[model samples]
Target chain A: FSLDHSDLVAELLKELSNHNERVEERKIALYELMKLTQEEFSVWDEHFKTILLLLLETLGDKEPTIRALALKVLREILRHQPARFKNYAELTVMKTLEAHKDPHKEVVRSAEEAASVLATSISPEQCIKVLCPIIQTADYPINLAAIKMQTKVIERVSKETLNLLLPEIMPGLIQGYDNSESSVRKACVFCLVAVHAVIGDELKPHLSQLTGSKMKLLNLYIKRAQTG
Target chain B: TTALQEALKEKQQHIEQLLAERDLERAEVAKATSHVGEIEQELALARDGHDQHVLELEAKMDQLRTMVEAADREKVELLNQLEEEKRKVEDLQFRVEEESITKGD
Candidate 1:
């Protein structure tokens, strides 16, 4: 059965690579074969691990569609095999975040999705270490992905861990309020509000300006200093 | 009159030939229908396997998710425990400070 399905999968992949009149049909066949392989992995644990590792490697496939599909499969595998594959998933996320610096937008987008999944599973302390540097950096995509993941981390992890990160995150939070990018500013404020809600008293001093009645920026800082 | 009659006859023959070709094409399509149905059946079986695998995966995911939730709960409890300890130490320090001030007076 293994040999026969392997041959079928190879043929389908070949057909998928070649331009054909019924390309969609061949692609559907490839998808079916991939699904079968994944299912077979559940019973055959070794094969499942091998297939997941192969899928991670394929995240850098020359074909964007294949790479995206591979990452999607990896996400499913990680979600299922969280305990057994924790380190591997972490490595995949870190590598993907590193790859966000790649010139390709599609690669960055896939990395963002993978990072988001990994973010939910991480401890808030680890998240602060992993995400704080990116948030401090000037890369728009990296910063945006980090901010989004930070919010997820905040939701998943404790408010105390957020408290530890708040002082470090405050500088960037204040600076980001002045960022020219609307998305960046929006994400920054969203994360700030979330963290604020989590660390209500601790955040009061830092956000006195935003919380206070004074619309003037000078009044905001004065109120913040007095509160702190 | 004779030329018009010849043209009409040729047109009738042309229409008959076209209809014959259409009938042959339909026959070929009917012959392929069984093969298409077989492929469809195979696809359905494959889809069922895929769906079952998806459910299995989701079950495993739920289990892992519960573990993560438990871990988070433990973390929060730990944090609360630490905070309680810190408050206790602060209260002690406050009493000591009050004693020192009274002694100085």
Candidate 2:
């Protein structure tokens, strides 16, 4: 017997990742299934790859509301994640942060909350990996917003990781510091909060003398901030 | 509650099935490799019996050359003993080869 969309998305997740009957048909079911993650999470959490893959695909849904809702649930599931689903926390964290730059105003707001939840759940390594690049962008189209959002991410990282955050943040910021482009140079100067997130004691004690010029590094950083 | 209950039971059943399959495979291999005990026995016997081969070879080269017809019976007996020892050594080597290939990492 032929089936209806009634149970269209229920258990066929494995078959659907590859587009079982067709991609369009599967895409439509993801839009509907995205709404049911909470109810399905107990059963679906173990099979997170399929659901996460589907929701991420829908994050690019042409419809603005669909995009917003898709992100909203990705955030919701991340917020409610059980210990068993820890592997997914990292993969979805990047997608969550991407939502922060969504073109729609409402979607951007959803991405912000979603990104915050992800930032809290993920390890410091993921935090630096995803958020560091945002701090370095000069021609970053969204104006000062992504750079501004970085403070919230920096604030969430603890002292233990700030030392690790430093090397990555410093080099990128250093490159930005010497750029001939005025806007890029200034953005590097503005990333001083990343320097603030770093605590001097944890940083210098853990590394070689090479990093000890480190103390003088940020001291001179403020000097490099010149008005164009 | 029903969904969660079912998931727990399903997970448990999945592990139980894996356990049963693993035990069945081990049984299949266990019976075949029982020769492990036999190989150990044969190897120990062959190792100690190596002394007999050395003694027989030494006796043949002693210039005794089955030299005296009076010692002819003794030479024939040594030859027979050497032949038996060669057969035992061959069996041990074959078993050793069988086991090293089959042992899992």
Per-residue accuracy of model 2 over A1-228 as CA lDDT, tens digit each: 223433444554643454324556554555556555555234453456666777777677666766676677777666555343456644565566566667797888778677666655555465556556655663443323344345455666767666556777665555554555444444444455344435644433323432323334444443433321
- lDDT (10s digit) by residue, model 1, range A125-202: 666666666677747766766777777778765776777777777777667655666556656666765675576656
- Candidate 1's C-alpha runs over 4 A off are A1-54, A84-90, A97-113, A207-228, B1-105
Model 1, residue B2: C-alpha shift (Å) = 99
Cα RMSD to the true fold for all candidates:
23.9, 37.6
Q: Report the alpha-carbon TM-score of model 2 versus the true structure.
A: 0.44
In terms of docking quality, model 2 is incorrect
Q: How accurate is candidate 2 locally (lDDT)?
A: 0.58
Clash totals, every prediction: 0, 0
Per-candidate local distance difference test: 0.62, 0.58
Docking class of 1: incorrect
Pairs in steric clash, model 2? none
Per-model chain B TM-scores are 0.62, 0.36
